[PDB]
Amino acid sequence: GAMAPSYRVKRMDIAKNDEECVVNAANPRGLPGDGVCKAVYKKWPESFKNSATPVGTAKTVMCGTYPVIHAVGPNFSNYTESEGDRELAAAYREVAKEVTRLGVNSVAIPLLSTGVYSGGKDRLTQSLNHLFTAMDSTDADVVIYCRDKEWEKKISEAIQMRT
Ligand SMILES: [Cl-]
Ligand SMILES: [Cl-]
Ligand SMILES: [Cl-]
Numbered sequence: 014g015a016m017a018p019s020y021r022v023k024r025m026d027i028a029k030n031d032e033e034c035v036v037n038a039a040n041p042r043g044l045p046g047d048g049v050c051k052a053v054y055k056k057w058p059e060s061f062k063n064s065a066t067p068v069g070t071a072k073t074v075m076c077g078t079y080p081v082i083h084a085v086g087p088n089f090s091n092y093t094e095s096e097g098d099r100e101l102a103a104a105y106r107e108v109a110k111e112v113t114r115l116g117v118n119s120v121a122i123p124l125l126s127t128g129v130y131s132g133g134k135d136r137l138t139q140s141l142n143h144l145f146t147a148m149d150s151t152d153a154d155v156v157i158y159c160r161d162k163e164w165e166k167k168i169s170e171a172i173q174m175r176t
């Protein structure tokens with residue numbers, strides 16, 4: 014575990030992370046996809062061997078010795094708000110299990126279901142709160158990656174609020 018487990022936020026490409034493993038915002042079929050998933054495919058393509066997994070689950074595939082945790086959030090275009098909320102919570106619980114099993118001291122993680130799976134809604138608070146519910150009992154350093162300047166400020170605020 015980390016000596017003083019922390020949360021941090023960085024605004025940059027998660028393919029350039031400085032952590033011991035990465036969480037991919039994957040699709041259920043293990044396809045290259047777009048956004049975070051396409052960046053992850055360009056950096057760690059070997060990790061997409063047999064990466065297909067259902068909504069609400071995470072499946073880890075090694076790229077060399079570097080673990081890529083494929084976490085499948087719901088597409089809110091297809092799920093009801095209620096069922097989507099349950100699947101998004103479940104995907105993060107499976108990420109916490111994998112991070113624990115791998116014995117890493119740090120993990121790079123995007124906000125699941127906030128991009129093309131958001132069904133056109135701002136889900137920063139919803140996705141971040143499910144991330145915290147899952148990861149708070151882990152002792153890995155968690156570094157959250159985003160691309161938007163206003164999202165960076167809001168995520169940083171939410172982390173600092175609890176400190
Ligand atoms: Cl960048
Ligand atoms: Cl997304
Ligand atoms: Cl973002």
